[PDB]
Design a binder for this molecule. Sequence first.
Ligand SMILES: [Mg+2]
Ligand SMILES: [Mg+2]
Lengths: 158, 157
Amino acid sequence: NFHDQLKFAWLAGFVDADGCINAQIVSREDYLLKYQVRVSLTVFQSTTQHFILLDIQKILGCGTVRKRNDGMSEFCVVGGTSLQTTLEKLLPYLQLKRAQAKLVLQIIKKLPNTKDPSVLMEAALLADKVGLLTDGKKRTILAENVRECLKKLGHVVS
Amino acid sequence: NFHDQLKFAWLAGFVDADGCINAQIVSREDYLLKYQVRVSLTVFQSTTQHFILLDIQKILGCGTVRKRNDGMSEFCVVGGTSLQTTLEKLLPYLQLKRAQAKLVLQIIKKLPNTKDPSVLMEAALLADKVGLLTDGKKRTILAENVRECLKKLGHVV
DNA sequence: TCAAAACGTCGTACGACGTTTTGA
DNA sequence: TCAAAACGTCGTACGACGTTTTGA
Ligand SMILES: [Mg+2]
Ligand SMILES: [Mg+2]
């Protein structure tokens, strides 16, 4: 209880410095609408101390630990139903990344309805807003891409 | 006050991620024994988020905040009489760096008596083992480096 | 058609030093 | 003579992407 809260606070502590609460637009050519909006919480560690990623998994009950080929390890929680559960446990304690969290929670809100081209569209717009709160000067794929390729598929968003 | 306990736990989580609990040999020419064992806790964030180091400072009640000329800011806690106070706060919640706290606390126990060459000498050997726990490889001054020099000052160890 | 599991890597936010200044 | 306050900067542990694979 109060014990579980101290681990969530420590974990929030850790995510705030090494975490990554994100929302990307991934192209998926088998999709009807060509795009998926991926939600994820990822925590990075050197494989030297890979043991730490299994601990977080334990504490959270969800997530995928891998070794990367460059000497790093990632622990990662992908997707709405499980990521939502993890965020509500961290949210009260997150400080630096409560915005990325709170936005992503409301992306999860709409993910069950993303077959609708305009629901998918508000989701992607929200993914951009998350990307501005991230020192990722990395993103090639934005909502504007989704929207007009949506337009090309004959769909009417706005 | 279990709220502090929540804040300390959060902090320990941060320190474990982007912190630095360390012990260093710095050459100081105006010292008799020419060497200080400097102990420190340090936390980094980009200056874009400079406010979080000031919060950290508020939680602990010790420590200096500075902007660096490079885009980053640091929160730093140097010296035994205020770094012991802080480490005993984290120590129950630290994970990744609990080893460096303990070693550094064992260093701090000796600093009061660091004029004594053998006492300095042992603090020196201790700092090197805090060095074998830091992904770092920058250090150019080793517990040896206190010894030739102590030797050459005509001291016995 | 969906979507997570698992993946590979470039760029920079950092870690970890040594250095210079203040002042007790 | 001590020693913190304050400093400057290179290397690498990370972040934040996009991509392939598995599988429902
Ligand atoms: Mg960070
Ligand atoms: Mg780290």
